[PDB]
Amino acid sequence: YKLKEQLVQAVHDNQILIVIGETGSGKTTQITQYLAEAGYTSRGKIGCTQPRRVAAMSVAKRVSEEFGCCLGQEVGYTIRFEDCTSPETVIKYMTDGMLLRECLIDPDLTQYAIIMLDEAHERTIHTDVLFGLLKKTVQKRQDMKLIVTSATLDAVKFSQYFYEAPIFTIPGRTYPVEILYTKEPETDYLDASLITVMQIHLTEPPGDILVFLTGQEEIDTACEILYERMKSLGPDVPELIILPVYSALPSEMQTRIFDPAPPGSRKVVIATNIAETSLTIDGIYYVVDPGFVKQKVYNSKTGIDQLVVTPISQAQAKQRAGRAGRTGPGKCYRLYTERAYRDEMLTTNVPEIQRTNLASTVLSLKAMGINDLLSFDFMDAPPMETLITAMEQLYTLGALDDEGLLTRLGRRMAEFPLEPMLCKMLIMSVHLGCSEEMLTIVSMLSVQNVFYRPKDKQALADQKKAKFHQTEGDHLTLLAVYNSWKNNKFSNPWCYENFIQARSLRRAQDIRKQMLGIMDRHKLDVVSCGKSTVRVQKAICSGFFRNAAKKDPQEGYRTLIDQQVVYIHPSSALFNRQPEWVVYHELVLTTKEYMREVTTIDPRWLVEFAPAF
RNA sequence: AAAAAA
């Protein structure tokens, strides 16, 4: 259709068009086929963006199904390191991170004609960066159309930025959500959610419950606990289809959240912020929102940015509530006090760009000739402090000139879609003749669930993981795993025998192919160091010198820069072989401020590789 | 332990 007619006319008339309304099916599904019916596929590709990987491939499957064509043909997608397309692709669904990474290659995005954006979700640095490059390709490509979805409120900001583009309203029925607060604050959200989910299931009418947890480890612990609490009520109680949802989860398991449970069994979808996307699960009436999210927080006092558990903002709590009243009138179970919401919780979430390290961002820009640092019209302004903070970081790495211009190492690191810390040490391993092993170690660091350690066999998993522990350090331990995997002919029963995640190695093997490509393409020689593993140590140190730490004889370690006590993680290949000097990869903050993936170094390197100190 | 993305 009734307002389909209006959209296709306004899309032909206006170059940039903002859109306020529905999400997923109704938005990206409906919209895209209308333009397909208007013959824009003849002029070039339609590039649709999605916040999450799962949704990018889920709308992409939906559309190819509707369109009739095979998936990966006319309708294809692109997620992670997989290009599930063809030259026959005419409708390509991808993540904002993907289009950005493509625009870095072709800043005129000549492959496309129409660029659909799902930005009615959240604003990530990738989105902030993309929005900038697109503003330029709008002036650079008079022919190119650009639809951008925005949240009802958000809409004014997007219009103003995109040359005062029209804000097209898509109508529909909104359903009321009776919000209910915890009488008094809970001791632990995890358990409380399981108290809630149990109650809701047994007492309340039909409707699938939706829980917002922090991470996999927590969702895993929620589901098991929820299952044994369910099974305890015998065959009397009706079935609950406990559904875990987090990005490490296989697609068959991720997509089953969208599946409508039997007529008597109700389902609980225990997700991360994976499910905060226009990822519109049908038949949800209950939301169990504890008001917590795993996100990055940045301190200018020391350039590092790490994941904390900052509570979800009021603006977010309100959309989570909205996740109930979509199929029909819902109920939002806020696991906090009304006092919490109006006081303890922030009004609206701080944009990624301010709460994250901007070195991997400055490098991206200064690389592609954006040395100006003002010209790129920032939709979410980055504070000049953290900008010059990040600028300084690259000088020490050897990526920026004394004046602030580009360097050889800088331009060489710029060719990889990697963190400057990882970049320096992979570009350096070429100069240091340990590139074969550094390609291994970078790809292995990229994947996270490397080792299999179940709760039912905690001890056995440690004894199996122990066979790989290097006297050298955790980085070389990862190398030992991947190298003994190829040794044992990429055997799946070898992984089962050794307690190694065969999927996580298979994933890491692809990134290694994907990186060897950039390597071989830009003439970076790929060479081994064989038994001379000290070559690897030196090269790791070249990139992670900022992450140097020294053994405090009283307790743990002390940072070379902060001088804040940091401790080797309980898992570490060094956790008991702890040495005087080390370089850590990441920093997990839990019980203690644990150093993630540690390797031994000789302090005599914090000058051989970091004279800018 | 990595949230999300590459």
Q: Judging by DSSP bridges, how do beta strands A145-149 and A112-118 pair with one another? A: parallel
Which of A540, A543, A278, A284 has the alpha carbon at shortest distance from A397?
A543
Dist. CA A141–CA A137, nearest whole Å: 5
Q: Which nucleotide is nearest to A597 (CA to C1')?
A: B1
The H-or-E segment that residue A513 falls in is helix A502-521
Q: How far apart are CA A214 and CA A169, in angstroms?
A: 33
Q: Which nucleotide is nearest to A594 (CA to C1')?
A: B1
**Distance, Å, A293 CA → B1 C1':** 15
Question: Rounded to an integer, what distance in angstroms lies between the CA atom of residue A395 and that of residue A402?
Answer: 7
Indicate the DSSP class of residue A406: B
Chain A residues 275-294 with Cβ under 7 Å of strand B are 293-294
At position A581, the amino acid (one-letter code) is: W
Ligand-binding annotation for A28, yes or no, is: yes
Nearest residue: Cα versus C1' of B2: A448
A22 is in an annotated binding site: yes
Contact yes or no for A426/A416 (Cβ under 8 A): yes
What are the backbone angles phi and psi of residue A489, rounded to the nearest 5°?
45, 40
State, as a whole number of angstroms, the distance between the CA of A529 and the C1' of B5: 33
CATH topology of domain A177-352: Rossmann fold (3.40.50)
What is the spatial distance, in angstroms and rounded to an integer, between the CA atom of A237 and the C1' atom of B1?
A: 36
| CA–C1' nearest nucleotide, residue A272 | B3
Look up residue A55 and give its two tokens.
């949704």
- Of A216, A215, A262, A281, the C-alpha closest to A23 is A281
Alpha carbon distances (Å) from A299 to A308, A310, A362, A421, A590: 12, 14, 17, 18, 18
CA/C1' separation A295–B4 (Å): 9
The nucleotide lying nearest A220 (C-alpha to C1') is: B1
Question: Rounded to 5 degrees, what angle do the CA atoms A378, A382, A387 make?
Answer: 120
Helix (H/G/I), strand (E/B), else coil: A301: coil
Report the phi/psi class of residue A234: left, alpha or beta, with left for phi > 0 and alpha for psi in -120 to 50. Answer: left
**What is the distance in angstroms measured between the alpha-carbon CA of A139 and the sugar C1' of B3?**
35
DSSP β-bridge partners for residue A161:
none
Burial letters A255-280, b for 16+ CB under 10 A, else e: ebbbeebeeeebbbbbbbbbbbbbbb
Pairing between strand A565-568 and A557-559? antiparallel
- Assess contact for A307 and A296: CB atoms under 8 A: yes
Distance CA A155, CA A147 (A): 12
Under CATH, which architecture does the A1-170 domain have? 3-Layer(aba) Sandwich (3.40)
Distance CA A609, CA A613 (A): 10
Encoded tokens for A587 = 């920093």
CA atoms of A313 and A296, how far apart (whole Å): 14
State which nucleotides on strand B lie below 7 Å from a protein beta carbon: 1-6
Give alpha helix (H) positions in A289-434. 314-322, 338-343, 359-367, 384-397, 408-413, 420-431
| Rounded Cα–Cα distance for residues A152 and A160 (Å) | 14
Distance CA A389, CA A450 (A): 33
Cβ–Cβ under 8 Å, residues A351 and A128: yes
Distance in angstroms, CA of A156 to C1' of B6?
Answer: 30
Q: How far apart are CA A481 and CA A465, in angstroms?
A: 9
Task: Return the nearest residue to B5, CA–C1'.
Answer: A97
Phi, psi of A543 (to 5 degrees): -100, -30
Residue A373: φ, ψ to 5°: 75, 5
Three-state SS at A80:
coil
Closest nucleotide to A587, Cα to C1': B1
Which protein residue lies nearest to nucleotide B1, measured between its Cα and the C1' atom?
A588
Q: State, as a whole number of angstroms, the distance between the CA of A277 and the C1' of B5.
A: 13
* A347 is annotated as contributing to ligand binding: no
- Stated in angstroms, how far is A356 CA from B3 C1'? 13
Distance from CA(A361) to C1'(B5), angstroms, rounded? 14
Inter-CA distances, A372 with A215, A361, A405, Å: 39, 14, 10
Q: Please name the amino acid found at residue A208.
A: D
User: In A 66-105, which Cβ lie closer than 7 Å to strand B?
Assistant: 78-81, 94-98, 101
H/E stretch holding A586? strand A586-589
CB A170, CB A3: distance < 8 Å: yes
Strand B and A47 CB separated by under 7 Å: no
Nucleotide closest to residue A571 (CA–C1'): B1
Q: Strand A599-600 and strand A586-589: pairing? A: unpaired
Structure tokens at A90: 């005419």
The dihedrals phi and psi of A64, each to the nearest 5 degrees, come to: -60, -35
Beta bridge partners of A132: none
Closest by CA position to A137, among listed A172, A106, A166: A106
Is A27 annotated in a binding site? The answer is yes
Tokens matching residue A184: 């008094």
Q: Is A25 annotated as a binding residue?
A: yes
Distance CA A542, CA A398 (A): 10
To which residue do tokens 């290694």 refer? A512
Through-space separation of residue A430 CA and nucleotide B1 C1' in angstroms: 30
Q: Which of residues 401-440 of A touch strand B (CB under 7 A)?
A: 417
d(CA A453, CA A548): 29
